[PDB]
Design a protein around this ligand. Structure first.
Ligand code: 802
Ligand code: CA
Length: 223
């Protein structure tokens, strides 16, 4: 997260860290046994780490659970990143409490101008790499579809939306992929891609979760 602030320990209780010997992507807990992340974060050997603040220190509240299976959307296109969503089923259910809690799926899509919270342990520098130990937060608005298509002509599909600042300086970045974009208490986006990080007129692009709620529900119901 570039231009963000320290969230504060366990203030984003649905945030998870996907780990394979190091943090490589974020994710969101949607119920005690499932996590939603980005399809491009897929790899085998994933351990889901819940209740984290400093990912390099066991401070208490952490729950490390192995993934039993990861389900990448069947129509995920790795060249366009269209349908960049994946569901991860945990080997055992997590113990939910005030520090580890799930976030709700939306019933309607969010409008331009909606203010959202983006969080993650990704790079905090736009020019270079500085990875934080604790969770960073960023408040950012959803941009109109015309400004998003004007910024990335021919690369935005109806399953994506832009959020951020066209002046540059505040954005999600590498290491934040798969993490949450929460607006009014509902999970509206998944950190997916962008051109560099916090560059002027190049806002971040997010997977539009409201287009996948029936898919998520039907997939969880059958697995
Ligand atoms: N500017 C952004 N809003 C952004 C967000 C997530 C990213 N994730 C990545 C990324 C880069 C890699 F080289 C490998 C995996 C990633 O998720 N770049 C990203 C850029
Ligand atoms: Ca920790």
């Amino acid at each position: 997260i570039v231009g963000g602030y320290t969230c504060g320990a366990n203030t984003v209780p649905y945030q998870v860290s996907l780990n394979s010997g190091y943090h490589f992507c974020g994710g969101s807990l949607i119920n005690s046994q499932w996590v939603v992340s980005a399809a491009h974060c897929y790899k085998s050997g994933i351990q889901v780490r819940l209740g984290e603040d400093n990912i390099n220190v066991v401070e208490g509240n952490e729950q490390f659970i192995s993934a039993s299976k990861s389900i990448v959307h069947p129509s995920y296109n790795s060249n366009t990143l269209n349908n960049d969503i994946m569901l991860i089923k945990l080997k055992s259910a997590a113990s939910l409490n005030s520090r580890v809690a799930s976030i709700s799926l939306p019933t309607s899509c969010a409008s331009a101008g909606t203010q959202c919270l983006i969080s993650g342990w990704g790079n905090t520098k736009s020019s270079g790499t500085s990875y934080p130990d604790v969770l960073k937060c960023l408040k950012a608005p959803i941009l109109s579809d015309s400004s998003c298509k004007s910024a990335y002509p021919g690369q935005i599909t109806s399953n994506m939306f832009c959020a951020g600042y066209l002046e540059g300086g505040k954005d999600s970045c590498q290491g934040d992929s798969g993490g949450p974009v929460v607006c009014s208490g509902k999970l509206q986006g998944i950190v997916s891609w962008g051109s560099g990080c916090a560059q002027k007129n190049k806002p971040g692009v997010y997977t539009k979760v409201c287009n996948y709620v029936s898919w998520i529900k039907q997939t969880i119901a059958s697995n």
